[PDB]
A paper describes a structure:
The first enzyme in the 2,4,6-TCP degradation pathway of C. necator JMP134, 2,4,6-TCP 4-monooxygenase (TcpA), is responsible for the conversion of 2,4,6-TCP to 6-chloro-2-hydroxy-p-hydroquinone (6-CHQ). TcpA converts 2,4,6-TCP to 2,6-DiCBQ by oxidative reaction, followed by removing another chlorine by hydrolytic reaction, producing 6-chloro-2-hydroxy-p-hydroquinone. 2,4,6-Trichlorophenol-4-monoxygenase is a unique enzyme that catalyzes the sequential dechlorination of 2,4,6-TCP to 6,-CHQ in a single active site through both oxydative and hydrolytic reactions.
Recombinant TcpA from C. necator JMP134 was crystallized in the space group C2, with cell dimensions of a = 107.07 Å, b = 180.05 Å, c = 110.20 Å, β = 97.87 and there were four TcpA molecules in the asymmetric unit. The individual TcpA molecules consisted of fourteen β-strands and eighteen α-helices and could be divided into three sequential segments based on their constituent secondary structural elements. All the nine β-strands in the second segment, β4-β12, were arranged in such a way to appear almost like a β-barrel. Another noticeable structural feature was that three long α-helices, α10, α11 and α12, and three short helices, α15, α16 and α17, which were all from the C-terminal segment, formed a sizeable helix bundle together with two short α-helices from the first segment, α4 and α5. Applying a two-fold symmetry operation to one of the two dimers in the asymmetric unit generates one tightly associated tetramer in a non-crystallographic D2 symmetric assembly. The tetrameric nature of TcpA in solution was confirmed by the elution profile and molecular weight estimates from a multi-angle laser light scattering (MALLS) experiment. The observed tetramer interface had an extensive network of inter-subunit interaction among the C-terminal α-helices. In the apo-structure of TcpA, a unique entry site and binding pocket for FADH2 were clearly distinguishable. The perimeter of the widely open entry site was made with three flexible loops: (i) between β4 and β5; (ii) between β7 and β8; and (iii) between α16 and α17. A structural alignment of both TcpA and TftD showed that the global structure of the two enzymes were quite similar with an r.m.s.d. of 0.78 between Cα atoms.
Residue numbers in the entry:
A (entry chain A), B (entry chain B), C (entry chain A), D (entry chain B): 2 to 159, 171 to 483
Write the structure that this text describes.
Amino acid sequence: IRTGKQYLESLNDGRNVWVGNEKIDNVATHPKTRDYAQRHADFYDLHHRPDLQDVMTFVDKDGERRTMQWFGHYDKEQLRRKRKYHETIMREMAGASFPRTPDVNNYVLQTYIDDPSPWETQTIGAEGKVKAKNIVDFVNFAKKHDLNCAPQFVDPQMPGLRVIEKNDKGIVVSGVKAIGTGVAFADWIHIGVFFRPGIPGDQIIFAATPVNTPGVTIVCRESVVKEDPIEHPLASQGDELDGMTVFDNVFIPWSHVFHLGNPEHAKLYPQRVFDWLHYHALIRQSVRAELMAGLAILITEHIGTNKIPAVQTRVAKLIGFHQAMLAHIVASEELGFHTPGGAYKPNILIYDFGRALYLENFSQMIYELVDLSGRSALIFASEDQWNDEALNGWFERMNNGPVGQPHDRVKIGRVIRDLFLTDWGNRLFVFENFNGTPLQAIRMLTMQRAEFSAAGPYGTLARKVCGIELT
Amino acid sequence: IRTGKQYLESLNDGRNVWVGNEKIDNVATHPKTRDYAQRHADFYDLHHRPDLQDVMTFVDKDGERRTMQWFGHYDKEQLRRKRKYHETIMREMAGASFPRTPDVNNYVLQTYIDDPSPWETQTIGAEGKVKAKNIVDFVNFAKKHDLNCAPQFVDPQMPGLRVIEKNDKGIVVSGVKAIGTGVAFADWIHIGVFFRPGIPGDQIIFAATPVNTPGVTIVCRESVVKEDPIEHPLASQGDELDGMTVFDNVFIPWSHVFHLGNPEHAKLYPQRVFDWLHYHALIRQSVRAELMAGLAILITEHIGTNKIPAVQTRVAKLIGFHQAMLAHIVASEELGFHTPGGAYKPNILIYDFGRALYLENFSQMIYELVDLSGRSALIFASEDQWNDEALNGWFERMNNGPVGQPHDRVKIGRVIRDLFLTDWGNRLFVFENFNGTPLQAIRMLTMQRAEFSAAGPYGTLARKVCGIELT
Amino acid sequence: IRTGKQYLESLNDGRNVWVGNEKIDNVATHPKTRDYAQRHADFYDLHHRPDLQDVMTFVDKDGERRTMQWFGHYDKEQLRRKRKYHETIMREMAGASFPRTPDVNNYVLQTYIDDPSPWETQTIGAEGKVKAKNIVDFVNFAKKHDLNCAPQFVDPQMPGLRVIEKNDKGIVVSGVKAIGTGVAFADWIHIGVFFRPGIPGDQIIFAATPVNTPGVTIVCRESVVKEDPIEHPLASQGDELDGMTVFDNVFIPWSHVFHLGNPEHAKLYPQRVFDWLHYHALIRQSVRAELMAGLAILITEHIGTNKIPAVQTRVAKLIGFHQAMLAHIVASEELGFHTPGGAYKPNILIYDFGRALYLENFSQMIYELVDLSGRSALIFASEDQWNDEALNGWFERMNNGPVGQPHDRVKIGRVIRDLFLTDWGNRLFVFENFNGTPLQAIRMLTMQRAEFSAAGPYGTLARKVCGIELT
Amino acid sequence: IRTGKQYLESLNDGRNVWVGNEKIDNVATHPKTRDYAQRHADFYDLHHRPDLQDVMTFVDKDGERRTMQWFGHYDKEQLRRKRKYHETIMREMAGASFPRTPDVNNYVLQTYIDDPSPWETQTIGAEGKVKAKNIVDFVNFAKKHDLNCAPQFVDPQMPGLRVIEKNDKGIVVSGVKAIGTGVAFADWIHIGVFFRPGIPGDQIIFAATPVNTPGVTIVCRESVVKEDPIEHPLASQGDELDGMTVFDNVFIPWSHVFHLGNPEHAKLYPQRVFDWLHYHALIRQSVRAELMAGLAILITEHIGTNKIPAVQTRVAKLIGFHQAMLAHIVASEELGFHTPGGAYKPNILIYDFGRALYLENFSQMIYELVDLSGRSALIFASEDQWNDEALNGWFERMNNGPVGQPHDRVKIGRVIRDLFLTDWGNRLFVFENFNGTPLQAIRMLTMQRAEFSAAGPYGTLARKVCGIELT
């Protein structure tokens, strides 16, 4: 039900935001932030598109219509409904150029809904002031208004956020949340933490607070959004800003506290929370792969190198790369399971491996596409050069191919340039490794699963072939 | 339901065979052949295993019980049942060490009985002498008797097989089939050919003839069976020979010819025949990967290196390789289609990309496992050394670890040796590139599919992101 | 003797230049071009540095002092003197960020000097108006004034530059030179061409003409130089612009013509010309590698991950990468030869292979460094954020390491960002493949050398081991 | 100058030896040992080759003529002369197929005679019982008689060798040396050890004892010599056995102990001892690569695939692999240094990086060659098949190409088979990772060098580009 207009309205709420060397008066209108804010506007609007109601919305138990980003899936086909929703969104929005739209941010909160209690029961030293029902109500609240709750669970390296005081009203926290994406554009900050060896319980904190909370400062890297939307058809659409959040004696009422103290809790449940983001990331990676492969096809075709055998095998490897993501998504969904609350989850082991595959090869694949695109990477016309009466004829002669109009090669060059050769595109590059646990982490925790031990069920085939042990 | 004993008897039919410098009087008993012969006999016997009845057999339309190698699948469920059959055989037989067991050779016959008429329809030099019913009758015959029909299509690179004469009794062919596997162990030779630029119609032959047919000579590489089965538990189980088949005026009755003359037919139909072998190669490939990963886990666990991060990382890498194959299989079965005769076939594009992913990496994955095993690969006790009173105490002290008995290290090493460090193991290495179209072919072939053209459906996302219209 | 001042002066000469959508009135002062122009100014100035006279200059035969960019080397130690010169330059100028300083552009002209005649004698249909002595004088002239002769030999894909008219005064040419680097900043355009299958002799053209020649238009991509030199300590120093050059009925007097017509000539001699640029490129690649490895060291040290074993091996691979370039440079020089004019040339086969090595791996190496640098890639402070009284303390706490001051991590982040995550840095990325023949081309012409044939001297060892042929 | 005949006689000294399950009465004559024994005898004989006198021998200070294995090099020229020796031996002997010929085993002795005193100086449990002169005297002795002294340092992974007793006649040691190569073929065992965390001083032993010493047992892997030398021209030349050596109260006179007790000495001195083996491993590695590239050229030429671009590319890839090794060798010799005793040593960092580059790629390079050979790898005529009247004409038609005789294909295939597809070939595969510190060790070790520290000289370029001072 929420509109881009309401959302844009809400932006101007006093929130304290740096973007580079500058303070931002109003995120909705400031030149450094307005485009990305409009993309979030577009997100809400897209749910009101009449031809999209089938995909974008569903009808809650209470009879109310809600956006699909709050939709629980209890079987495989519902799971696939959820993915069709996420895909549709990222397909409309610059081919997955914006990995943290609110559907991704809020997906994660399905874990609380599914099983609120342990967050309450496992909470150490809050004298039963943490109340599972609070979490549940908060999410319902977020569902009701379509609030965008940016998650922040990543802490500094070896200043972390900590409770400095507790009382009958709530808590006061102080410190920094080291990594956050698009928080300046959100409604709530969703506080979390991951277990680390020797972490203190006053740093074990799960909670929510509005972006404009007194004492909160959002501190973001400089925006790298482009001015000219013809030269930069993608990079001009907004910069999904990354930064940290700073907490100066910030008060959180008990009703927005989710769990405190128990480091035991903080090792499995936070992962349970993030599994949904990990799964989205794979979905996204698949789309980015399909995009890359398509660009390969278009460019090699327009230049006319596509039937050169050495080029063909190169374009196939890009298509294969896409297919490898797709296959892990589909397999994971095929071999999923049910969580405590009965929600259907895709196979964690499989989709994370799908991510490992992406994170291990995406760099080289980008290289292949760029390389295939040759001089059309750096050197091509600006629009005024192309339309100049004296230059235009030389230009059409130099970009004449077997398909489309010559100027099409420039359309393709602009997309490749923005996606892979600009600050804007390169942020997304770097971010791939922060959009969920990174490659080496994925492989490590894999090796923790008991199932991969010597006597474990996985290496059953190996022991038989070697004639070892048994029973 | 044929038995091993019956099979072994069937071998003494006077077929003439070279294994290296030696003619073979009886493949069933010759010291260079008898083990692998026994492996095939074991294959028939597995179907009489009371505890494998459910996996190994099916009851057909007529209440007739038959081996699952003859099972047709019109369902994802059914296909899946066939996979489990193939997998089961492979896990019982030296872990996928025997790539051309009859269940595989006969798999391709499905294509014929699915859609036999165009085979007859399209023949040139016909005279209605080529009859579809003969093709069906033959397979049905092969079915009743559990006949092993080894496929031989691949030709000498740029002397193939050709029709010298054709009367109304049958045809006469001379020439050679360059590559065949275990033909010396089959019952019948399945003749065929692939289209190539400028192929004479007198070389478009699909037929079948017994292995001992007059004018036929099977010419095999030397055998690399190992004598000592303690030292060589796998390599001593027998050598699946490769070689050529020579046809010297070989006569074939019209009852046994399936197509002649039309090289257009040779384009896509022989490929349909082999889609099944390719899919099986993927099944087998994942089993191989599962074994490899298993071994890595056993050896690092037994040595005690398994918890070194940089080691963990590598074992997870191998587990990922397996999950990747499994993902393509499962995904391809999810998104399969129906052939003209109604059989359900997994997505060719996907399962073929799964093979490419394997052919592209197995060499490096194999090296990963070998490196991981250190000296335990190379130097290890022979059995008599182990048991020697003076040596034994030294060997035991040197092979002690956190897991199992010190001698289990020798057991593990022996398997890794046979698999990857012997003539025996290495023929499987080189053979992978011949169990279907090689990696380059897969890649060339996908870029011929029309959907990957600039205006194809595949590039729609990219055309849209670029603001480009086709058409 | 020439100064940056004189050079900057010369810039304002009427030359016709587009940079993006804009016409440039004066390359020396325009905001889009002034920084890179000042870098060329700095180049000339650096030769007047008293402490550098040993390296930057030498004394000609005529007793005159000249810059080392005109210095012929006749033995190994003189060769190494030349490299010490090129290195010194690229070491002073933003760690090899500017691959086409004039020393590189002009190096190539040593091939004419060394052997002028064939250019004259092989010229077809110029009625002996092409005169080797002209080439020689031109170069002397360029040596005398330290002119910067930007080379342009690359033609459009499949508009090329052609002679449209010849006469007693000279020639008129029309067409486009497709790729050119920093031509807007040069003094002369050095025209050339490489042989291609089925190239017409009216397109075989070697010559020189001033940048501001009537009829010449330089058409460059948009400048991506940064405004803020604190946030962007490298990208703010200027953009080495790439573009094409357009010739509208441009007249070249015979005295600046070098060769015409003979396509035979155009297959070996142009390569002979470019060998010097190829060699420089390897020298440059080595420096860029040493830079990357150093950054790896600095960043892993400041964060404190350097002694983590998995990180150590990663930093070593970067150092190894540097060493691989260095080793090819040193070997090539060790095993060099003499050209017709007696100049000492490093081993072509070896240094090109050094380039192949770089071009094949540089993408992954950059990836390794970026990845190693973690969040310091995207998220770090702008200077005003860092110095803010309220933020400064949180910031120093989050960037506290075992070495240097916390703010040092930001210095390192700025360099990594500019070098690998900006339009500016990414141009250099793409350009690596245009700075000499690309990877696949290197490998192809390798396979043309007669020495690599079957009977050739290279595979002598293989024939002996196989017992094949001989004498 | 020792002869082969003398060597073979020397073998029948009653040394006790296991090769697999068998004790060996006379290594010189035993069917499992005699070929490799003959290879060593051939090695001595090469030095009497009249036409190899110049490469194989040198005249020393005293006008004494000696084998180049005993040559000390104080010059780049001299080092280079020694390289040519090593290379020559390798090219005469199955192309580097025998990694542990005596010239290699004895190479490490140079370190002793270069700088013997600290070996004595540093001993603990001394009593001046350990004398440097004995070390020098021994090597000089080994020199006069051309003694093969096999080095054994590597220990059992976490039972090594230990001193039980020490009187004033000598010492008594028990334990086992885990890895040795061709010890059963040597004259003397060269005892040594590497430092490791927490190593008892009674395990710091450097000494030498005859192979047939009482209490010594050489325990070797089964031998994989091939019988038929037509079919197996390389693998039939003999198996360089690997295994362990057991010491059961072995007595060693003080004349023959080189150091005891001090594990600090064990740090960098044993490494100095092996610097020479490592450098030789590089020499050998390039020869191996040269052979591989040679074979690729022969097989693609003979098959006629050699001019397919995508094939050209791959062969150039293999030629590049060879040039890369050659470059590190040549470069490392250019930038070598002088040891304490004055010997000239090539740059360790460089030549060790050359080994890493090899260990990192040889597996994939090997696969490249094997793939390139197609079926010609696997299936090919045995000799008797080739010569058979009926078969012969078929075989010849099938092996015809643009180059050589059709049978040369078989010759090529046989070598590629032995080299990479047999137990014999594969032990060389696995052994590469043991001919010196493995790839991980090389990498770990360079990051210990102080020059790679943040403030080290190496990172100066980067510190300067970042505007950072050290510290």
